[PDB]
Design a protein around this ligand. Structure first.
Ligand SMILES: Cc1cc2nc3c(=O)[nH]c(=O)nc-3n(C[C@H](O)[C@H](O)[C@H](O)COP(=O)(O)OP(=O)(O)OC[C@H]3O[C@@H](n4cnc5c(N)ncnc54)[C@H](O)[C@@H]3O)c2cc1C
Ligand SMILES: Cc1ccc(-c2ncc(OC[C@@H]3CCNC3)cc2-c2ccc(C#N)cc2)cc1
Lengths: 131, 660
């Protein structure tokens, strides 16, 4: 029930009262802590400034234009080969194998690699991806 | 509402009986509640009858007259109540007209040391009770610490100048009997710093609450947290105040640290984000070069090369989108950095100047309690607040000396007569005194009782100025040493004319240092004439008494010139300067509950001393040395109404003894 605008706890009292100089010691230690924090603030601010100077220019220039492709469902021989390779590299990021094929969706890829099981030894390709 | 109001004026609960009524009417309190109500009504009604016309004596006959049934039955009851209220000074006290001319057959003899309000009240009451009373005063005047300077049509109180409310104040009655004009006071105390420039309203009001809040905080630190002893030694109000201030400054500091720590956290999290973004960037650079080297293999290509091109395309797009996400987060963090950088917590608790003004407020508190706050008990300094009177605090415009003088009419005061030794035995008492003008003229007054109204400062004197034979017991001397006697001073400045704002009654001055917060800290106007009173309080008082008059008056005129202009202060016509701690007959100002004492010490100092048996094996003697004064009343200390209440009480006690 202390007053409003006043902050008084048992512990803090006992701390500031325990010694004849405890008050000034506590206060001036906190004082020092504050300087320390703000020294490190300035440190890190200069660090991050340097890093941001590095990132000047963003990534705009090695971006590649986006293209849309209507998702067909007829697997072309070329698309099947692309898919086998994309498995060997991306394993089971089939979103990504759809991305590389470009003209397939994630469910059509997922099908494919039951569709063709035996025929493209896809099990073995995956095994190889895992080493 | 009227009888109950009579109970209220007389500081008595209207709906129950007090301990003194239980001791003088043990049969009524101990029996049926109805009869208790009857008694209470007779009490309140007799008191109302007295209070409605305090300038005439109230006789049992008139009381019964003006009573009705069923309360006009038990005539013995009414007579008993009247006698009780008259012996203890609740009715027929002060300056009234006697309807029953006293008797020349006087019983008993009492010597009252001191002709202040306490002694004068006790003497008037004992004379009305039928005793022979002689007062022995050292000064050339009556009143004591009620002193009024009067030169020409300049009048200014040098001691008491105020009535701390008229709701329940005995002085109210006296004011009707003496025709003393009371005048209100106006809140407004415009504060002015050393530069002479007023304090802006908004810092003034700030600091004024910070003061009230810090005081409430000392109270909380005492009553809930029990911080009343430290270093095996009792805590003062000033020690608690400084502890509280230190903890508030600590709070500023810690909040501060936490703000900057949030800033560091967010900063370094930005660090990791940016750091990852630099790496991701070089990686995107390399992957783009690879995509370009693969997409420049001509369009006639096997499927492994087409796969290279398209796989590098996908990988590039993925890493670029990841970079864009990290870049959104960069902004959602910079945003909070500049939010927090832009809401800084407070820098300080109290600026230097803010603190000077807080010192002014502390000095006001030191003035009203007449002692450095380092001397007051954190636990019992405000023990008299529960008994404060209701209403607005008032001033005495004609000179409050009007009261003591009027109370000295028809009494046997021996002025210029200073007591050197008080002797008390089981047969009587002997007061030895001298002439203040010729110390060699010695006087011996023999008595049945002595009433000591000597100030606590005189009783504290070592080497003693008044010797008690036999020596006073230890349970009294230790109380005398424990209780505090303070000091406050005034500078009366009479002038050509008003150069201040007639619409303001108080205006203040903020001091440069905490040690000088009492040095001429308030100037006060309250009279018809062009008079200003400059008040000295706290540790300043005791020091200012070793500075010449002219130097004090010059400091006063200097601040007044800095405030109103060097061309608006005339040089003062008449100047007076108080020095109460040096007064050999006061030794200070008024009492204060000091660290290490309590209100029980007041009561102890009010307890009568009973001699020992002269012949061994003789019946227990009767008490002989009685004490009164402002240092003897617990619920109303260091006030004129307290001194009058003490005198009435001791008169009642002495009469209960020697008159029955
Ligand atoms: C500056 C100041 C202002 C105050 N203003 C107020 C105020 O406005 N209102 C208020 O309620 N209270 C006020 N107080 C307190 C109040 O004035 C006193 O409590 C009270 O009036 C004194 O009561 P008293 O009769 O017991 O003491 P005193 O009036 O001092 O009675 C003791 C008497 O004994 C005499 N005496 C001393 N030594 C000897 C001796 N050896 N032999 C013989 N006689 C001796 C003294 O001269 C004195 O006349 C003020 C106090 C101070 C210091
Ligand atoms: C404007 C103003 C109004 C009231 C008070 C005050 N207010 C309270 C109080 O209390 C008495 C204390 C209580 C504890 N024991 C004695 C005393 C005083 C007081 C009054 C007049 C003088 C003089 N000249 C000195 C002090 C001051 C200024």
């Amino acid at each position: 029930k202390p007053p409003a605008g006043m902050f008084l706890s048992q512990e803090d009292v006992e701390a500031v009262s325990a010694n004849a100089t405890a008050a000034t010691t506590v206060l001036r230690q906190l004082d020092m802590e504050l300087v320390s924090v703000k020294r490190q603030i300035q440190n890190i601010k200069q660090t991050n400034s340097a890093l941001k100077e590095k990132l000047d220019g963003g990534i705009e220039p090695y971006r590649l234009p986006e293209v849309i492709q209507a998702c067909n469902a007829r697997w072309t021989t070329e698309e099947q080969l692309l898919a086998v390779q994309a498995i060997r590299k991306y394993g089971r990021d089939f979103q990504a194998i759809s991305d590389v094929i470009g003209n397939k969706s994630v469910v059509q890829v997922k099908n494919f690699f039951a569709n063709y099981a035996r025929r493209f030894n896809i099990d073995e390709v995956l095994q190889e991806w895992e080493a | 509402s009227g009888v109950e109001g009579a109970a209220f004026q007389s500081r008595l609960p209207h709906d129950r009986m007090t301990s003194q009524e239980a001791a003088c009417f043990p049969d009524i309190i101990s029996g049926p509640q109805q009869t208790q109500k009857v008694f209470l009504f007779i009490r309140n009604r007799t008191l109302q009858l007295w209070l409605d016309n305090p300038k005439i004596q109230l006789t049992f006959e008139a009381t019964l007259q003006q009573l009705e049934a069923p309360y006009n039955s038990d005539t013995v009851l009414v007579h008993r109540v009247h006698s009780y209220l008259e012996r203890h000074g609740l009715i027929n006290f002060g300056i009234y007209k006697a309807i029953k001319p006293l008797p020349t057959k006087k019983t008993g003899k009492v010597i009252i040391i001191g002709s202040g309000v306490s002694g004068l009240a006790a003497a008037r009451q004992l004379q009305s009770f039928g005793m022979d009373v002689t007062l022995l005063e050292a000064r050339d005047r009556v009143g004591g610490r009620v002193a009024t300077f009067r030169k020409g049509n300049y009048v200014a109180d040098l001691g008491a100048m105020v009535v701390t409310g008229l709701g329940g104040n005995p002085m109210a009655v006296v004011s009707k009997q003496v025709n003393m004009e009371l005048a209100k006071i106006k809140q407004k105390c415009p504060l002015y710093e050393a530069n002479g420039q007023a304090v802006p309203k908004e810092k003034d009001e700030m600091v004024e609450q910070e003061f009230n809040r810090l005081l409430e905080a000392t109270s909380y630190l005492s009553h809930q947290l029990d911080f009343n002893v430290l270093n095996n030694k009792p805590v003062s109000l000033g020690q608690a105040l400084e502890v509280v201030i230190q903890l508030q400054e600590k709070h500023v500091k810690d909040e501060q640290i936490e703000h900057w720590k949030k800033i560091v956290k967010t900063q370094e999290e930005l660090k990791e984000l940016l750091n990852k973004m630099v790496n991701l960037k070089e990686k995107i650079k390399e992957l783009h070069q690879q995509y370009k080297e693969a997409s420049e293999v001509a369009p006639p290509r096997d499927i492994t090369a087409e796969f290279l091109v398209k796989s590098k395309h996908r990988d590039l797009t993925a890493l670029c989108k990841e970079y864009d996400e990290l870049a959104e987060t960069q902004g959602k963090l910079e945003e909070k950095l500049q939010e927090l950088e832009a809401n800084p917590p407070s820098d300080v608790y109290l600026s230097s100047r803010d603190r000077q003004i807080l010192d002014w407020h502390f000095a006001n508190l030191e003035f009203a309690n007449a002692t450095p706050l380092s001397t007051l008990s954190l636990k019992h300094w405000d023990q008299d607040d529960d008994f404060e009177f209701t209403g607005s605090h008032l001033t005495v415009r004609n000179g409050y000396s009007c009261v003591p003088v009027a109370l000295a009419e028809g009494l046997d005061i021996k002025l210029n007569t200073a007591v050197r030794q008080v002797r008390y035995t089981a047969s009587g008492c002997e007061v030895i005194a001298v002439n203040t003008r010729s110390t060699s003229q010695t006087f011996i007054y023999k008595c049945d009782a002595v009433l000591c109204t000597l100030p606590l400062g005189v009783l504290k004197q070592q080497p003693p100025a008044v010797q008690f034979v036999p020596p006073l017991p230890e349970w009294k001397t230790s109380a005398v040493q424990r209780m505090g006697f303070g000091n406050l001073n005034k500078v009366v400045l009479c002038f050509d004319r008003v150069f201040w704002d007639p619409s303001v009654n108080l205006f203040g001055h903020v001091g440069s240092t905490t040690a000088s917060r009492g040095e001429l800290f308030l100037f006060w106007n309250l009279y018809k004439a062009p008079i200003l009173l400059a008040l000295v309080a706290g540790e300043a008082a005791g020091i200012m008494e070793n500075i010449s008059d002219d130097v004090i008056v010059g400091r006063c005129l200097a601040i007044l010139k800095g405030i109103f202009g060097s061309s608006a202060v005339p040089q003062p016509k008449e100047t007076v300067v108080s020095r109460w701690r040096a007064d050999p007959w006061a030794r200070g100002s008024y009492s204060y509950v000091a660290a290490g004492s309590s209100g029980n010490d007041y009561d102890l100092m009010a307890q009568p001393i009973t001699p020992g048996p002269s012949i061994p094996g003789a019946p227990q003697p009767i008490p002989r040395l009685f004490f009164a004064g402002e240092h003897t009343i617990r619920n109303y200390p260091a006030t004129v109404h307290g001194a009058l209440l003490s005198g009435l009480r001791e008169a009642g006690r002495i009469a209960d003894q020697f008159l029955g």
